[PDB]
Design a binder for this molecule. Structure first.
Ligand SMILES: *[C@@H]1O[C@H](CO)[C@@H](O)[C@H](O)[C@H]1NC(C)=O
Lengths: 48, 48
């Protein structure tokens, strides 16, 4: 029980400090925003 | 009120509202981050 409690207490730090993952969700958000921004920025091209 | 506005040849449709944006005296209109017109200057009242 003590070992589990220590590990579950370290989770709250290692989730946002060690990074590793949690970049996948942000990457999904960033890819969606990039796609939408590029789509609405292509409206400024004369295309000839 | 959603209107068809024609500012000195610039044609568009939308609602024109009072703006807190401070245009420098040489600046005539403002563009959003994706190059869409966001603010305009009144030729008569010099209003943003
Ligand atoms: C046009 O005339 C009005 C008064 O009728 C004046 O307030 C306005 O500044 C003038 N527009 C200019 C100088 O662009």
């Amino acid at each position: 029980a003590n070992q589990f409690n220590s590990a579950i207490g370290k989770i709250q730090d290692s989730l946002f400090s060690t990074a590793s993952a949690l970049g996948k969700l942000q990457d999904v958000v960033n890819h969606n925003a990039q796609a939408l921004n590029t789509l609405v920025k292509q409206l400024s091209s004369k295309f000839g | 009120k959603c209107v068809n506005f024609n500012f000195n040849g610039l044609t568009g449709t939308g609602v024109l509202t009072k703006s807190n944006k401070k245009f420098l005296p040489f600046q005539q209109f403002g563009r959003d981050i994706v190059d869409t017109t966001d603010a305009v200057r009144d030729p008569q009242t010099l209003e943003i």
